[PDB]
Design a binder for this molecule. Structure first.
Ligand SMILES: CC(=O)N[C@H]1[C@H]([C@H](O)[C@H](O)CO)O[C@@](O)(C(=O)O)C[C@@H]1O
Ligand SMILES: CC(=O)N[C@H]1[C@H]([C@H](O)[C@H](O)CO)O[C@@](O)(C(=O)O)C[C@@H]1O
Ligand SMILES: CC(=O)N[C@H]1[C@H]([C@H](O)[C@H](O)CO)O[C@@](O)(C(=O)O)C[C@@H]1O
Ligand SMILES: [K+]
Ligand SMILES: [K+]
Ligand SMILES: [K+]
Ligand SMILES: [K+]
Ligand SMILES: [K+]
Ligand SMILES: [K+]
Lengths: 256, 255, 257, 254, 256
């Protein structure tokens, strides 16, 4: 039972943080990148290394200790460091003779969510015979049905650097206490289009004027910002990701 | 069509997912078509069944009820969009040492909510195409069938039977259904798939009346051909994904 | 026409529902919806396209119930019919690469429709004034080099089906007071078709003063072009492909003085 | 001081402006000369018939203190479907294919004002020598490649001001409304919408449209649709005419 | 605390100017261009020449001396010289035999801000081993974490032609007293799309009806307009920038 909002000086707070991307980090110099992508020799033998798999990011933010619950009302969010994609002068492959290096481009996924509990995930796999690596949490006992929808694959985004992007999505049958937004833009040559502004606000209230209600006084933020692939001189490609800023305004809400 | 009932018991909701029906050429390839082959002449076009994506449909029974369930709102979403980030599974490298070419090219994204079966009109790219045993296709195709032959009328009344390429929603009918679709062509067309649990489509017409569910049945239909997967060899297969539906319904009295 | 009040009553409304088939050239008895394959002249002076190679405007004059009262067109629902046919990539087209599917229909499109109370009015404009348009078409007569940009002599009525080639006529913006027209040319040879369908969208046909097209002689004029792109054969030869268009129009009786 | 609107009180301007693309010979109205490339910045010296220019018409209004105030505009590019001629000495896209359609860099621009469009000069390359019979930035310096405030002009002559070295001056033009889109890239496809159902309101944030000094309305346009490539591969700009219809009303001023 | 707006003919003022782009200016004939872009063999050896790095533009505009503050309320802005990109006859590379020159295209960054103090910057680098050149102001003591987010890299955009675009962005964790807008459009061949009009106004008021308040009676304007790359006959590529016009309206506001 959701009752009234509490007012007065004491009754609002705000959360401000950033989530780093988790692209795989194949060595000590390559934070924000994946390992270069290799292609299996057969469909059955698909078997990606952990460092080659971008994962969902998540942070659990503790809120001032409070029945009253913190209610998330608005979000401002922004991808951090968009201009880094203008470095086309290192380690790259020329577009044509004497040209600059091919920039980061191709498949992107940009995703973020704000909830009063962990994001709920449904497992779907491109190829059910893919062997996901040790160190990742992935759909277990995958069958051919898992290539389209196997309802056995439920999980919570409850751990950072763990849930690979390619085999999990937000579960649309759950997540009543979360708001989520994502865009997959495919193709090998698609250009990144990245907007920044400190003037845009998303309102998190549902159809009844109620935002996510924070259980245990924790706010859950989740994100993926795979911007595309970087291409080395050899032609090998590595995913590149960026950090995401969150600012969330919250108010106290009485419940029963 | 009279008034809406109110009160605790007067609303219900349907929540489900429709699986895609892309052809399923073997026991490992659910969600995929058979690789596509090209006829040697225009006249000799003869696609195999496993190579033809078909419309999906589910009839959802509603609480037994003159009142009729009226579909009012819809939330819908393509499920498993991130699978298209698998570019390491024996695809064809974009260039020497590159990652695999992702799923791309021609897509059809379509969904409908009705109080009866979606009504279909048959149109063919090529009237001499021999559609295969086990599909339901425009019968007695003439050259006029390439643009409009009003004989080709059907109901989307069976799963994995109606090929996407030779049927569309009949604009001359479907008064009790709401449909939406986008065909995006070209072989290099990039998929653009959005997800969110914050978007609702209102199903009410210009008089504030939604689809009215005959016999207490809700009809959901879909196609989500996302593009084609290219194998190492160059062969291509349609790839489809599931669609989530959530529909809100209220009891409406009628005479 | 001084326009006066709308008439009411069960008797006072009617609707028109039909489809216009595309007129792409139809080069033989198996190729309804296609043009002849396209060939290119070696000079501007030798441009002489065959009729079967030229897409034309579609038109239908629809008789309305006989009636001073006039039928006033108020709303339109319209839809391109058969959009999913473009998923046929297995019918002797040209493989995009070794072992791949056939290149789908793509490239230059023109999607156009109008609703009016009289024939659509046309202005002739030509890419190349020395193009000789063929017998059996209606085209800009006495073309001069000024016809490549604007020659006010080239006025016509879309008063005949499969006759007015798309490429040399457009709706005349200096006229057409009693018609509503809408069109998009999307160029480029690799341009992907984007075709939306739905039965929930309505276009209101009333002007800034709340008046829609008034049907002279109790006729409603519907016009369309839906050139979807080009189909590429295995040989590399290319043919325009078109699709039919559905129209549903609501009309009401309007008194005029 | 702008005062009340009069309520005889309205008039309408209807016309078209032809494109001015270069017109290299008597058969190529609407096209430019084929484009050639200087081998150095210093040697850039385009011929006039290779340079699209701004189009302008000064339209005299009924003699009238009252001024004509421009309130609404309807506008359209004329002949959009000519771009479907892919059978006329173009270059096949591939063996046995149709000709490459017009595509690549486009500039679509129109303005309505109560005086000549005010122009600022900016040049890609300050060492470009602009030809006789054109009006161009004079005394160009390297600063002219980004902003040289010396280059002020009025769009006061047709077939004269090259598109490439002039833009509307955003520091002036209070008495004009202008709108333009430059869509670059060599392969970019043209997207041309036509309809007779769209109106643009010309009033500013205070409810005042352009006021016609000396009872003249100034219409300006550029519609470079792209480049046509012929069978040899050479490329030439292709432009189209623009329709304007403008509603005006009489306004008293002090 | 923000109190009432002043009224009267004397209560408003306006600022009108342009910011020139700062692309590198490799010689006396190439204002508005960078130096040719080259590609270092490794991240380790990445060492961009100063003339090769586009920088942020900034101007500090003094306002009429004024407790009252000037409050920025509206902005009109425009890229100046968009039609220059139609010069495809000047020292370029023909797209195909006998064709015109390939126009300016590829990665673009269009950005502008209006504030009552210097734009606040956060350093993010594509590659932490990039050696930024003498004469630039850049993230100091970069580590591998600087490739995603390192909170030590805080700066003010307080100097023209000094802060490279590629290693700095607006700090979303600050800039309360500034409004900023930017778009990074990536890709090797992405076409420029440039709109111009004198009929569009951006409102600078925040959600409480308050615009940027000008400390010390100074308005801060910042911009980047990297339009793409110019490809010369050899195929070497240079960034090309254009100037940006600003018109800002301000009003007097009382504060305590
Ligand atoms: C940015 C970078 O470090 N590139 C290097 C990559 C990556 O380190 C690995 O691909 C990580 O998986 O390795 C190479 O052998 C290669 O693939 O060509 C050399 C190249 O310079
Ligand atoms: C995803 C998958 O199964 N791919 C395999 C395909 C398909 O099974 C068939 O094409 C179905 O028609 O078959 C191959 O022989 C091929 O065409 O190259 C091997 C390839 O790895
Ligand atoms: C759809 C179709 O019929 N395609 C066929 C075309 C057309 O009939 C003509 O081009 C009409 O002009 O004719 C061919 O000889 C060709 O050009 O390659 C064979 C091709 O399969
Ligand atoms: K495996
Ligand atoms: K057959
Ligand atoms: K001829
Ligand atoms: K010169
Ligand atoms: K000014
Ligand atoms: K270094």
């Amino acid at each position: 039972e959701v009752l009234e909002v509490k007012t007065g000086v004491d009754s609002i707070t705000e959360v401000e943080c950033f989530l780093t991307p988790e692209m795989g980090d194949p060595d000590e110099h390559l934070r924000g990148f994946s390992k270069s992508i290799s292609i299996s020799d057969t469909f059955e033998s698909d078997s990606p290394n952990k460092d080659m798999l971008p994962c969902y990011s998540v942070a659990r933010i503790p809120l001032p200790n409070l029945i009253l619950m913190w209610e998330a009302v608005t979000l401002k969010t922004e991808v951090i460091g968009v201009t880094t994609l203008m470095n086309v002068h290192s380690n790259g492959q020329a577009t044509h003779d004497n040209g600059a290096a091919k920039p980061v481009q191709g498949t992107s996924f940009h995703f973020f969510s704000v909830g009063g509990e962990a994001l709920e995930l449904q497992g779907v796999v491109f190829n059910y015979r893919t062997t996901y690596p040790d160190g990742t949490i992935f759909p277990k006992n995958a069958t051919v049905q898992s290539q389209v929808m196997n309802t056995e694959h439920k999980a919570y985004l409850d751990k950072n650097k763990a849930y690979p992007v390619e085999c999990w999505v937000p579960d649309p049958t759950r997540n009543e206490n979360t708001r989520y937004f994502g865009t997959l833009t495919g193709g090998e040559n698609v250009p990144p289009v990245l907007h920044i502004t400190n003037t845009a606000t998303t309102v998190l209230l549902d159809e009844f004027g109620v935002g996510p209600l924070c259980k245990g006084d924790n706010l859950y933020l989740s994100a993926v910002d795979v911007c595309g692939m970087f291409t080395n001189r050899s032609g090998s490609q590595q995913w590149r990701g960026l950090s995401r800023y969150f600012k969330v305004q919250l108010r106290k809400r009485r419940v029963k």
